């Protein structure tokens, strides 16, 4: 009717490693983006997108307090 009317889950291991890096540094360096991608079999975009989603999740965590 209207124009508006017209994904892979990560393993518990991939999420564990991605979380570990975020807990160390909330921001990803160019070198870490390539190191994480190779070790976890995810693309460089996937690691970047994850960090952006995790920062956005952290935003909603701090705001949830008040």
């Amino acid at each position: 009717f209207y124009p508006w009317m017209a994904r892979q889950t990560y393993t518990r291991y991939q999420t564990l490693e991605l979380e570990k890096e975020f807990h160390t540094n909330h921001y990803l360096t160019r070198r870490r983006r390539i190191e994480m991608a190779h070790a976890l079999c995810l693309t460089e975009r996937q690691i970047k997108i994850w960090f952006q989603n995790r920062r956005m999740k952290l935003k909603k965590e701090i705001q949830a307090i008040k």
Partner: protein, 58 residues
């Protein structure tokens, strides 16, 4: 956990009356949150869930 009969009635009345563009603005989401007795995030979740489930159920 599940929204009251009235809250869901309010959300559905909005959705179907705005079927051309069911994307309420920040203030419209706030007005809906105050009326339903829920949060703005809950309104955003509800609309997101409603838009996908409506288009699939066609």
């Amino acid at each position: 956990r599940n929204f009251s009969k009235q809250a869901s009635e309010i959300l559905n009345e909005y959705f179907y009356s705005h079927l051309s563009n069911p994307y309420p603005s920040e203030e419209a989401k706030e007005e809906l949150a105050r009326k339903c007795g829920i949060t703005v995030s809950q309104v955003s979740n509800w609309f997101g869930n409603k838009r996908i489930r409506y288009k699939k159920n066609i």
